[PDB]
Amino acid sequence: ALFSCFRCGYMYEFAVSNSYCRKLTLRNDHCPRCDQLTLFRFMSVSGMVGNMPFKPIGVPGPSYATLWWRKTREGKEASAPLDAVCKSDRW
């Protein structure tokens, strides 16, 4: 799931397992933009840990918002300035 800093709005993705059910809607984490422990708000769902019986892994599916965020952060245009620095496949 995607979690966004309450003030900064910086977003980070991390799937949540069953062990952390009561920490999905709200979280507390050390945001990078603000060097303080800040609250993080749930914004979108990425994908469950493990998989449901007798189905492929990605059947639950990431949300469209998560897909768009990942595309923005790792797409053709996004990767073009950085891919030259270091081919994303190797070093």
């Binding site: 397992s17 062990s19 840990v49 493990g50 019986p53 007798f54």
Partner: protein, 256 residues
């Protein structure tokens, strides 16, 4: 040509394995260490009673977390072999030591501190051990509650273990929040500072007086609900006092 019995058919609890060609369906990658299906077939771990597969998974997580927190755990019924196999899988993850393995263990367990403890100590503890890392003794004392066999599931190579060395579990300590008993010949051992600090912080909660009030309130609650042998909250006495605190502090200083 087709076999006589066609399709995946459930057999007796103790039945052999036939190589007749049938379409096999597995819910997921059972070969994964901590993601193992529960069933009465020989290829699956025994499925101890639970209100749902999710509840069974929660019970497995709790059992594994308790095992990591204190190697020894007493579990009743079919869940003992499941706990032993899960402990072996956790040891395999720790020995693998991959970042993906650590993240998987973090997903599984409830306590990241225990995840770190396992990944720190189990590698060196079971470096020389090939396959079986957890032993499962059977206790002749059955639980009075429902008369279910009890199993003492323990980790092996306690001497090689760093934070659990010289620990004897023949009898629990005076209080559950006190450090476990220590063998006489192993009284000078010293535990890792981080684990020691975590245990001290956990014990301070019970050392607080509001816990004593909660304990008396629990006496009252059980008395109201119907549990017979629950002494009246007027007669109950605090688990922790000042003289006992100083005596246990001296004992902890001596043991180091």
């Amino acid at each position: 040509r087709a076999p006589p019995v066609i399709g995946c058919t459930r057999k007796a609890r103790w039945a052999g394995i036939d190589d007749n060609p049938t379409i096999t369906y597995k819910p997921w990658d059972t070969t994964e260490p901590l993601m193992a299906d529960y069933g009465w077939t020989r290829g699956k771990l025994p499925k101890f009673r639970a209100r749902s597969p999710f509840h069974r998974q929660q019970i497995a997580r709790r059992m594994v977390t308790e095992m990591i927190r204190k190697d020894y755990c007493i579990v009743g019924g079919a869940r003992a072999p499941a706990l032993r196999i899960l402990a072996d899988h956790v040891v395999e993850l720790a020995k693998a030591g991959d970042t993906d393995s650590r993240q998987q263990l973090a997903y599984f367990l409830h306590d990241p501190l225990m995840v770190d403890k396992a990944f720190d100590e189990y590698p060196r503890r079971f470096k020389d051990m090939n396959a079986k890392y957890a032993m499962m003794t059977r206790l002749k004392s059955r639980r009075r509650t429902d008369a279910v066999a009890m199993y003492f599931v323990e980790y092996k190579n306690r001497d090689m273990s760093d934070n659990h060395k010289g620990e004897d579990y023949s009898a629990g300590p005076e209080r559950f929040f006190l450090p476990p008993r220590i063998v006489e010949t192993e009284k000078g051992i010293q535990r890792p500072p981080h684990m020691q600090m975590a245990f001290d912080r956990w014990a301070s909660k019970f050392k607080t007086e509001e816990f004593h009030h909660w304990w008396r309130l629990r006496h009252a609650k059980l008395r109201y609900w119907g549990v017979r042998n629950v002494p009246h909250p007027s007669d109950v006495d605090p688990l922790w006092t000042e003289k006992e605190e100083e005596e246990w502090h001296n004992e902890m200083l001596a043991n180091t």
